[PDB]
Structure formats: structure tokens, C-alpha cells
Paper text:
8-Oxoguanine (GO) is a major purine oxidation product in DNA. The major way to remove GO is the base excision repair pathway, usually initiated by a GO-DNA glycosylase. While no enzymes with an A/G specific-DNA glycosylase or a dGOTPase activity have been discovered in these species, a GO-DNA glycosylase called [name] (for Archaeal GO-DNA Glycosylase) has been initially identified in the hyperthermophilic archaeon Pyrobaculum aerophilum. Despite very low sequence identity, [name] is structurally similar to eukaryotic and prokaryotic OGG1 and OGG2 GO-DNA glycosylases and, like these two proteins, belongs to the Endo III structural superfamily partly defined by the central helix-hairpin-helix (HhH) element followed by a glycine/proline-rich region and an aspartate (GPD).
Tga-[name] has an extension of 11 or 19 residues at the N-terminus compared to Pae-[name] or Pab-[name], respectively. This non-structured part of the protein was cleaved between residues R8-I9 by trypsin and the first residue that could be located without ambiguity in the electron density map was Y11 (Trypsin was used to remove the His-Tag because the internal proteolytic site between the Tag and the N-terminus of Tga-[name] is thrombin resistant). Another part of Tga-[name] appears to be more flexible than in Pab- and Pae-[name]. In the two molecules present in the asymmetric unit, residues between L236 and G240 were not clearly visible and were not assigned due to high mobility. In fact, the mean b-factor for the N/C domain (43 Å2) is almost twice as high as that observed for the HhH domain (23 Å2). This observation could be related to the absence of a disulfide bridge between the two cysteine residues present in Tga-[name] (C32 and C250, hypothetical S/S in Supplementary Figure S5A), despite the fact that they are close to each other in the 3D structure (3.54 Å). Despite differences in the number of disulphide bridges, Tga-[name] adopts the same conformation as Pab- or Pae-[name] with minor differences located mainly in the N/C domain. Under the same conditions, the oxidized and reduced forms of Tga-[name] are indistinguishable in terms of their activity (at least up to 80°C), indicating that this enzyme, like Pab-[name], does not rely on disulphide bridges and instead achieves heat resistance by means that are insensitive to a reducing agent. The sequence alignment based on 3D structures unambiguously shows that the catalytic lysine is strictly conserved in AGOGs and corresponds to K142 and K162 of Pab-[name] and Tga-[name], respectively.
Author numbering: 11 to 236, 242 to 263
Write the structure that this text describes.
Amino acid sequence: YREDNEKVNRLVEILRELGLDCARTIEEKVDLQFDALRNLRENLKDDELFIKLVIANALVSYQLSGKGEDWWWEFSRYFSENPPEDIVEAYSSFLPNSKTNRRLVAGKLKRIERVEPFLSPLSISEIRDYYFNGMERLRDELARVMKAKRSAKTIVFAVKMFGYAGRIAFSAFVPYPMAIEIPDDVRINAYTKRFTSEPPVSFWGRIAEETGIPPLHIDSILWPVLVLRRLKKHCGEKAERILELRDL
Ligand SMILES: [Cl-]
């Protein structure tokens, strides 16, 4: 493949300097979705219900009628005020009446109906196992349940959000698996072409191995590269390194 080795070498070193510490700070302090999850977890006081709601919610988080951060806050406030029991019934009222996710409701409710027989029986012990030692397994099982490709964008997003939910519920950071490849993203794809003609999944897999940053955490870092005020206020002097990534 045609590669700009010098630019790739700089990219790797900048990502090494940011590291998992920066990715985690972006996920928890820059991404307002994380605080939305903290609010819901505190208000429900039922970590099994909280985590299952996050997975189901992520599986319907496509073609939104608003910004992602607004949607996750609407979800958090709605289920804090109207805590659910029957998840299909709850979403049947929530989605068409929401501001930020009222499009394609029929297909979204079918997806909730499809996932609930898998999520409902899970115990907190099994959920802990998925979080601490099984996020790749969860991705594969969700894809099977949903009759979706293993790399399907919304399946992978559900695992990403599950990682946030577990970090909150279990008070421990577990990095995303190296095996979950870089998400398929129009902005990432255009950025990759600055460095190589190689397909991004292969390229970012090597970058992940060379930096020790799993691809889903690289994706977190690339979000502000590709909000900026919130980053400068939380990553400290490492915020300039984010600006270095955009200008590569
Ligand atoms: Cl999907």
C-alpha cells in the first residue's frame, strides 16, 4: 500500500503520548453521554436494569432526530422520571413521543423486541463477566441475537456504551478489547487516506497494536480530532496534541 511513513510515525507517537488516559478522559468528561449514564444509574439503583437499558437504547441509536448527546440525556431523564418494567412497552411510548429519536420507530421497536429475550434473563453476575472478561463475546452474541453482521455499526456501538455502563456500575475501568476493530466511519475513512491507501480496519488494527490503545479507544480520541473547549479544559497540556492530530 502507498503509505506516508513519516506521517504514520508521527501519528503513532502522538497517540502513544495521549494514551488510554486521554481516551478515558474524552469518554468520561468530554462526551456528555457518559454523565447522562451516571445520572440514570444513580436514579434507578438497579444495575441489571440500567445496563440492559443502555444496551437496548444503543441498539436503537441510529438515524436519530437530534444530536447523540441530546438523545442520551433525553433517555436518561425520561427513564429517571418514568422508570420502566416492560421494556418493549416503555419504548413503544418513549420513542414516538421523544424529541431526539422519533424516526423509524417501527424498526426500532422490532429490534427491542428481538433483543429482550436475550437481555432479560441475564444476571448481574453474567453481566459482570461480559464486562470484565467478555466484551468481544458480548459483541458476537449481540450480533447473533440481532441477526446482524459481527461488525455491524450499531452492534459495536452497543458494546461501546455497555463499556461506559459497566465502568459506572462496577466502579472499575476495563479497556475495550483489541479484537473489536475500528468503527466504520465516514470521517475516519477520510482521515485514514491522509496516511495510507490501506483499508482502515487493517490500518487502525496495527496502530492499536503499536500504541497499545484498542481501536474503540482510538475512536474516542479521533472524535474531537475529526467540544474542543471541553477537551482543552480536561486533558490539560495534552489537548494541544489533539490539535496536532487534526493538522497531520
Ligand atoms: Cl445492527
